[PDB]
DNA sequence: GGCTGCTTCAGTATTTATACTCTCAGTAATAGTGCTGAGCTCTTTA
DNA sequence: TAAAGAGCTCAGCACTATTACTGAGAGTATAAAGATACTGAAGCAGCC
């Protein structure tokens, strides 16, 4: 009904990758759309953790330019 | 009054120069908008 | 001395009212401005 536990959702969202195995990005976007989640009201749904690995894998995949590398 | 030759048509093999005037109209973007929380503010006395 | 109140106000997602603003409309009264070829098929056309 209500699913406001962020770190529990971390346990559930690692299930996405560790189970499916595409990437943390696509796994959690799949989560966001499955339960119909916007992108500004997420801090109430998403563990504080997965965000950091998301940033990591993002910059490592080079999603943005050198303008973002130095910082 | 039924009757044959011409006939006409129909089927094959990029990139277009000069309104005007409101006048309104209702719209979609857009700033005004107020929360939530939360994080620092602050003092308390144990 | 320092764990622990109760509040002072600043990130961070909306909302209503807005403001260019683009569209729909209604006025407009000098003129006179082309080198197939073939086969075929009904219709038309003149006749005993």
UniProtKB/Swiss-Prot annotation:
One of its GO terms (molecular function) is transcription regulator activator activity. Coiled coil: none annotated. Residues 31-61 are annotated as: Interaction with host RNAP. GO terms for biological process: late viral transcription. It comes from the Viruses. Activates transcription at late promoters when the sliding clamp is present. Binds to both the host RNA polymerase (RNAP) and the upstream dsDNA. Belongs to the Tevenvirinae late transcription coactivator family. The C-terminus is involved in transcriptional enhancement. Interacts with the beta subunit of host RNAP RpoB (via flap domain). Part of the transcription activation complex containing host RNAP, the viral RNA polymerase sigma-like factor, the coactivator gp33, and the sliding clamp. This is Late transcription coactivator. It comes from Enterobacteria phage T4 (Bacteriophage T4). The chain holds residues 32 to 102 of 112 of the full protein.
């Amino acid at each position: 009904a209500k699913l406001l536990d962020r770190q529990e959702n971390g346990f559930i969202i690692e299930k996405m990758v560790e189970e499916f195995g595409m990437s943390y990005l696509e796994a959690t976007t799949a989560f966001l759309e499955e339960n119909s989640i916007p992108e500004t009201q997420f801090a109430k749904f998403i563990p504080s953790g997965i965000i950091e690995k998301i940033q990591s894998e993002a910059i490592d995949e080079n999603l943005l330019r050198p303008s973002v590398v130095r910082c």
